[PDB]
Amino acid sequence: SMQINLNSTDPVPSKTPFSVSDADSYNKKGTVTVYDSQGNAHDMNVYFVK
């Protein structure tokens, strides 16, 4: 479960084709840690584009 707030005046990103490398390609980045059935932590990143 995750809660966020978003800006009304936030514009669309400049580089429209989404790419997980460049920051300007999205609007927001968030992170979370998930644990598998073996005890290994994986990092899941959520990316927000208006």
Binding site: A23, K28, K29, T31
Partner: protein
């Protein structure tokens, strides 16, 4: 201050916060905080674009 140019308190811990990258550098607020440093590297020039 420290030879590594870290912002270090008396007990050795390093102050943490957002770093700055670019030319001119800009704060990446979305990036997770990192140990802030104050290096001695100089800056490059930018050509004139308005007079």
């Amino acid at each position: 201050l420290d030879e590594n140019r870290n912002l270090v308190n008396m007990q050795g811990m390093q102050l943490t916060g957002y770093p700055a990258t670019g030319t001119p550098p800009t704060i990446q607020q979305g990036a997770n905080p990192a140990p802030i440093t104050i290096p001695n590297t100089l800056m490059a020039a930018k050509s004139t674009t308005t007079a």
